[PDB]
Amino acid sequence: ASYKVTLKTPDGDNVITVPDDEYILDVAEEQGLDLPYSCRAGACSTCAGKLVSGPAPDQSDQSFLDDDQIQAGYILTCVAYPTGDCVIETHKEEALY
Ligand code: FES
């Protein structure tokens, strides 16, 4: 299955198609977007984004955000799979400090 993921970047909004078994960061980069990252292993906050609408992405592979933050919609985009059409704001790391 695939989903329409709207990424709202500081530069502009981009609607891309992401399959249910690929990570959002991976697919965004394939489409020419430049999103932040460092570890790419779910263990830091560099790739953080925030869910604006749509179902929550599958974060079973993330570990850095606290249960509280997954709670509130923060997403580690490097290890997040989409689970429905959704809109995510990227570059949100500063927001977690
Ligand atoms: S780049 Fe470290 S958690 Fe995604």
Numbering used by the authors: 1 to 97
Provide excerpts from the study.
Ferredoxins (Fds) are small iron-sulfur proteins with low redox potentials that are involved in diverse electron-transfer systems. The plant-type [2Fe-2S] Fds function not only in photosynthesis, where they transfer electron from photosystem I to Fd-NADP+ reductase (FNR), but also in electron transfer to such Fd-dependent enzymes as sulfite reductase, nitrite reductase, and Fd-thioredoxin reductase (FTR). The crystal structure of plant-type [2Fe-2S] Fd was first determined for the Fd from Spirulina platensis, a blue-green alga, revealing to have now known β-grasp motif or UB fold consisting of a four-stranded β-sheet with an α-helix packed across its face, in which a [2Fe-2S] cluster is located close to the molecular surface in the loop between the α-helix and the third β-strand.
Notable revision of the main-chain conformation occurred in the segment 67–71, where it adopts a short α-helix, commonly observed in other plant-type [2Fe-2S] Fds. The Cα positions of the several residues including this segment in the present model deviate by 3–4 Å from those in the previous model. Omitting two residues at the C-terminus, r.m.s. deviations are 0.32–0.50 Å. In contrast, in addition to the C-terminal residues, large deviations of the Cα atoms are seen in segments 9–12, 31–34, and 59–72. Here, the orientations of α2 are different; the helix in the C molecule is tilted by about 11° from the helix in the B molecule. That is, the conformational variability of segment 67–72 is caused by the diversity of α2 orientation, but not the deformation of α2. In accordance with this observation, the temperature factors of the corresponding atoms of the A and C molecules are large compared with the B and D molecules. These results can be interpreted as indicating that the intrinsically flexible α2 segment is fixed in some molecules by crystal-packing force. In conclusion, the present analysis has revealed that in the plant-type Fds, the active center and its immediate environment are rigid and highly conserved, whereas the segments that encircle the active center are flexible.
